[PDB]
Design an enzyme around this catalytic site. Structure first.
Site, PDB file in Angstrom:
ATOM      1  N   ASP B   8       0.881  -1.195   0.000  1.00 19.30           N
ATOM      2  CA  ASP B   8       0.000   0.000   0.000  1.00 19.30           C
ATOM      3  C   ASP B   8       0.909   1.232   0.000  1.00 19.30           C
ATOM      4  OD1 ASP B   8      -1.806   2.090   0.468  1.00 19.30           O
ATOM      5  OD2 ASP B   8      -2.436   1.298   2.446  1.00 19.30           O
ATOM      6  N   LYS B  70       2.252  11.539  -3.742  1.00 17.14           N
ATOM      7  CA  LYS B  70       1.174  10.792  -4.433  1.00 17.14           C
ATOM      8  C   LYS B  70       0.154  11.770  -5.028  1.00 17.14           C
ATOM      9  CE  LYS B  70      -1.992   6.930  -3.556  1.00 17.14           C
ATOM     10  NZ  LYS B  70      -2.353   5.923  -2.535  1.00 17.14           N
ATOM     11  N   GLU B 175      -6.918   0.165  -4.815  1.00 15.94           N
ATOM     12  CA  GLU B 175      -6.966   0.148  -3.329  1.00 15.94           C
ATOM     13  C   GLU B 175      -8.262  -0.485  -2.834  1.00 15.94           C
ATOM     14  OE1 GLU B 175      -5.844   4.167  -2.315  1.00 15.94           O
ATOM     15  OE2 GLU B 175      -3.832   3.798  -3.157  1.00 15.94           O
ATOM     16  N   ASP B 198     -13.120   4.475   2.661  1.00 13.90           N
ATOM     17  CA  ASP B 198     -11.669   4.578   2.943  1.00 13.90           C
ATOM     18  C   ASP B 198     -11.373   6.001   3.420  1.00 13.90           C
ATOM     19  OD1 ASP B 198      -8.909   4.690   3.046  1.00 13.90           O
ATOM     20  OD2 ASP B 198      -8.601   3.820   1.030  1.00 13.90           O
TER      21      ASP B 198
END
Lengths: 523, 523
Positions: B8, B70, B175, B198
């Site tokens: 991850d 990211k 994800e 999430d």
């Protein structure tokens, strides 16, 4: 399926056979001929002729007399074979949707186009009617033969011709294979090489077949698609037309009737010259007033044709080469077609094979139909009922150990089950008080080499000299395949038993076949 | 391919797992943490910090501490997302050849520009080293996760980050799909609707996934790219900085060390408040001389954040709308991220779904790495050898007709070939002199419904009561797949046979599958 006939659908002639009451019968048509011309004709008056009547008016009606449909069947218009053949066929062939069709006047001035398979259908209808007249029953099923080189389209178009004629064509088989079957060469053990030399009315086919443990293979084919008996007839026709013009100044070629009568007598002369060394051709009212009267010697017949006769050997050398075989590798020579009756042809073939005799006993004009009729006979068996009963049998001998480690059988292998089998046993020693019953499965004479299923004792055997007590051992296999073994002292009623189940310690089908190999060594 | 890990690569935190000896292990780093900050820092002295050490000095070194790479990875400079993000990132981002680069001082005054994927490479190197320390082997292969909304450029730049870190990135997976795989939802039969909620360190992603007969589809995504756990931390930081200034007159914001210690204790307090209803924040030597000592209640934590907490529901309603689904259509709720441990967040989600319980059993901070590690486990199977042997088997049951038109099998469907199988048959009638053996192919109990391959007779059966003669029928399939059927009277040696070839009258693969449908109806 019903009465099944065998049909040779030949380029120039067709032949029909039936396997009836243990024999092949080749069936004569309504003219008494055992072969029928593959000819169809339409007269100006709208009459449809098939077979002998069509062929015996070709000269006067060249445009509306159809033959050699087998050269066109299952082919496309632009096939180079078709483009060659239409050059010397006297009837009109046209393209419709990329396929060749035969265009004729069916009567008056009414033009029709026929597919080649529709012309072949009319020939097959005549062969069906020939068979029906003989059998006095409708014929619904047929085996039809084709050249080994026919492709799927040519085979299907031949099937379609039969379907149109009202036949269920159960099988299409190869002509050379049919001839081999006629001579029973399919019943040969081992591998055999078969040379089929088929010199027909219009074409010459040489085929090398192998028969190996019931399987036929066409290994190689050659020949000449335009060499046949009619070419030898043509050479003789040419000779006598020249000769007649020299001697009378009359030109026979333009007179259809004169030509047709000469062809007729020339064919009979050719046949005679296969039996004797000269033939008289005599025709009363031949041309205008005058008769015809000439002798043809075999020597002259041979001389007019020797180049054609000799040429038949080249295709034979080519199939031997293509098959990679020597002359000595050929086990069987099968002669097919009328022309193989010609002594010169028989000589050339025998000499080519260093004196080896061909197969004999079947008319070479009839051998292909004969083979198809044999194969038809086998296929009518499709309607029979299976009159076998499955037996439930014990797969391996069952028994007990007797003194010396000996396998003593109670239930032999292949005994029908369920079953009950008994034998009487006794003691090995004076006053022996106990038996040990060891149950074995297998074919070997000593139990050390068989499969132990279980043991049990019988105790309390009363005193007696050895061999005096009688103990009955019973093996029973019940409807569930369960084995029960009983031992009973017949003097006392003292009894014990074991139940053996297919749960544990059962041999595998692999292990069983190894054991079955030792069956039938001892009784 | 080697030891394959699952990573991850998170916006704020990264996590590495391995499938080892039948279990996923989430691997603690050299600080004992099962998650690692996605942080890289360059100290004035030219030291490179990655993970916990980078994050725990951000306050004093705002210019040369890099995080949130990211947000930039795989994007162009003029992407409006990039133009928004650079406004509140404390490190310099510049354009080079239309792409964003991170400009830092790596030590002394030496300026370097790093591609976002080069910063992510350094984070992936730390995750690789974490896995290597645990496994005591080099890690060469990885599955790396990305947001479902990542485009091809963002996926390739993530792959490039792994390549630079020395990883072969075998697969990039979504994800939410990784989290669903962690909970084994890919093994559900039928169609299932999965809601993935999430709520991470820096971003909030809601995903509606369908699983249908082994295929995952991301149907709809929503959320808030700038809402996460750090925002709840920020609300608490703000509160306590105000409170401290009121009570001491000291302004903590400009003291990096004080701020960093408060953040630290505020994060631990937040975690405690997921387990209990108050937490003590105590810092010895906090600011100048003085300590810090305050209590945070869950109620106060909730009050400072309730507007942020409530806002998480709107994206959930939007994905249900975009997916055209009702609340009752959701089969599975999967909670991902540390923040989903917050009781208020769990309450809001459960209440939104009218009391439906989410999935439980995997740490929500670790679920994505867990799923990647499962998928990594499957991909290491790429190195295994196929230990299967192809069997040659007979496609359809072969047998003969027995009395009543019954299909009696000799060679069951799926028998390995070549083979030889025998059964014993007898007569139906006293002194029956002939058998007709009809060979059939097919699964149906009566031969009228099976395919007839051929017939032959056995003649000259000696007289005996019905059921007494023993005729052995043998089916053999040779190495060429040729079927030969023999019938032999075991009393005489009288024998006949047929050879059946795949030349004529063979069923089509179409016809075979219709027949195979009737297999396994009877034994």
């Amino acid at each position: 399926s019903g009465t099944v006939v065998g049909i040779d659908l030949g380029t120039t002639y067709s032949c029909v056979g039936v396997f009836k009451n243990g024999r092949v019968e080749i069936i004569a048509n309504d003219q008494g001929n055992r072969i029928t011309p593959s000819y169809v004709a339409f007269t100006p008056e709208g009459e449809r002729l098939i077979g002998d009547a069509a062929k015996n008016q070709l000269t006067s009606n060249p445009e509306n007399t159809v033959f050699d449909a087998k050269r066109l069947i299952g082919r496309t218009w632009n096939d180079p074979s078709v483009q060659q053949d239409i050059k010397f066929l006297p009837f009109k062939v046209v393209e419709k949707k990329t396929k060749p069709y035969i265009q004729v006047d069916i009567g008056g001035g009414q033009t029709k186009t026929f597919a080649p398979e529709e012309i072949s259908a009319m020939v097959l209808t005549k062969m069906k009617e020939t068979a029906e007249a003989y059998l006095g029953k409708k014929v619904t099923h047929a085996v039809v033969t084709v050249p080994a080189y026919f492709n799927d389209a040519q085979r299907q178009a031949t099937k379609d011709a039969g379907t149109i004629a009202g036949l269920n064509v159960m099988r299409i088989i190869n002509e050379p294979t049919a001839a081999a079957i006629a001579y029973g060469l399919d019943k040969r053990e081992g591998e055999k090489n078969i040379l089929v030399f088929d010199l027909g009315g219009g074409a010459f086919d040489v085929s090398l077949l192998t028969i190996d443990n019931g399987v036929f293979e066409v290994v190689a084919t050659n020949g000449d698609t335009h060499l046949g008996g009619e070419d030898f007839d043509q050479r003789v026709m040419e000779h006598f037309i020249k000769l007649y013009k020299k001697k009378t100044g009359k030109d026979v070629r333009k007179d259809n009737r004169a030509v047709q009568k000469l062809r007729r007598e020339v064919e009979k002369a050719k046949r005679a010259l296969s039996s004797q060394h000269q033939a008289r051709i005599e025709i009363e009212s031949f041309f205008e007033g005058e008769d015809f009267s000439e002798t043809l010697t075999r020597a002259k017949f041979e001389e007019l044709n020797m180049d054609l006769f000799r040429s038949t050997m080249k295709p034979v050398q080519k199939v031997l080469e293509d098959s990679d075989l020597k002359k000595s590798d050929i086990d069987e020579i099968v002669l097919v077609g009328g022309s193989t009756r010609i002594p010169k042809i028989q000589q050339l073939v025998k000499e080519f094979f260093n004196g080896k005799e061909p197969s004999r006993g079947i008319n070479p004009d009839e051998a292909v139909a004969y083979g198809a009729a044999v194969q038809a006979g086998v296929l009518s068996g499709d309607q029979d009922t299976g009159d076998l009963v499955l037996l439930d049998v014990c797969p391996l001998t069952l028994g007990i150990e007797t003194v010396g480690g000996v396998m003593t059988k109670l239930i032999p292998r292949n005994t029908v089950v369920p079953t009950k089998k008994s034998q009487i046993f006794s003691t090995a020693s004076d006053n022996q008080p106990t038996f040990t019953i060891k149950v074995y499965e297998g074919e070997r004479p000593l139990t050390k080499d068989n499969h132990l299923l279980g043991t049990f004792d019988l105790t309390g055997i009363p005193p007696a000299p050895r061999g005096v007590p009688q103990i009955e051992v019973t093996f029973e296999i019940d409807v569930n395949g369960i084995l029960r073994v009983t031992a009973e002292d017949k003097g006392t009623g003292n009894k014990n038993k074991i139940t053996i189940t297919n749960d544990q310690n059962r041999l595998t089908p692999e292990e069983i076949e190894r054991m079955v190999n030792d069956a039938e060594k001892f009784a």
